[PDB]
Amino acid sequence: IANRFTSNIKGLTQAARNANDGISVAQTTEGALSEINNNLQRIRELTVQ
Amino acid sequence: VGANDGETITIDLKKIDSDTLGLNGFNVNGKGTITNKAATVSDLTSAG
Amino acid sequence: SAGSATTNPLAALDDAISSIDKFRSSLGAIQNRLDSAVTNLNNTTTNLS
């Protein structure tokens, strides 16, 4: 049972690290998207003009 | 995200560019609707 | 011949760990019974002497 618990603990720690990496991916993509949105807003203002 | 097989979370990505948003020939400096000239006998016979 | 990625890696690793644990448990049980045999032999030797 101690061996099983050790396996579970190590797996869960590594899984937490993987989830942190996923959060990083999402943050980067969302920053790029925000820049794209600003560009689109400026384009719409130009078209209105 | 888990310690066993199958414990996965999926992030869906979308191809964002001009093509998937339209805007390709976003030709705002164009001419728009233009009234065409009336036909005449010369091009009437030119048509055959 | 070349192969491909294993379909279910964690299950195979769990099976290997379980086999190792079963072997260790059997070995420990045998060693405990051997120690008990040693104690009984010492007592019998003393009494017969």
For residue C24, give both structure tokens.
Answer: 């260790």
- Write the residue in A11, A25, A47 that is nearest to B11 by C-beta: A25
Task: State this model's resolution in angstroms.
Answer: 3.6
Cα distance between residue C17 and residue C23, in whole Å = 10
For B34, left (φ over 0), alpha (ψ -120 to 50), or beta? beta
* Torsion from C-alpha of A20, A25, A28, A34, nearest 10 degrees: -110
Long-range CB pairs of A24-28, under 8 A, 24+ apart, other chains included: A25/B11, A26/B11
**Residues whose CB falls within 8 Å of the CB of residue B14, separated by 6 or more in sequence, listed in order:** B20
For residue C17, give both structure tokens.
Answer: 């760990």
Q: Are A34 and B17 in contact (CB under 8 A)?
A: no
Q: Which of A29, A37, A44 to mutate to test the interface with B (most CBs of B within 10 A)?
A: A29
Determine whether the interchain pair B1/A7 forms a contact, defined as Cβ–Cβ distance below 8 Å: no
Cα distance between residue C30 and residue C35, in whole Å = 9
For residue A22, give both structure tokens.
Answer: 């996923």
Closest Cα to residue C14, out of A3, A31, A21, B31? Answer: A3
Closest Cα to residue B16, out of A33, C1, A11? Answer: A33
Q: Which of A13, A18, A37 to mutate to test the interface with B (most CBs of B within 10 A)?
A: A18
Q: Which method was used?
A: cryo-EM
Cα distance between residue B11 and residue C7, in whole Å = 22
Length of chain A: 49
Closest Cα to residue B29, out of A46, C19, C41, A12? Answer: A46
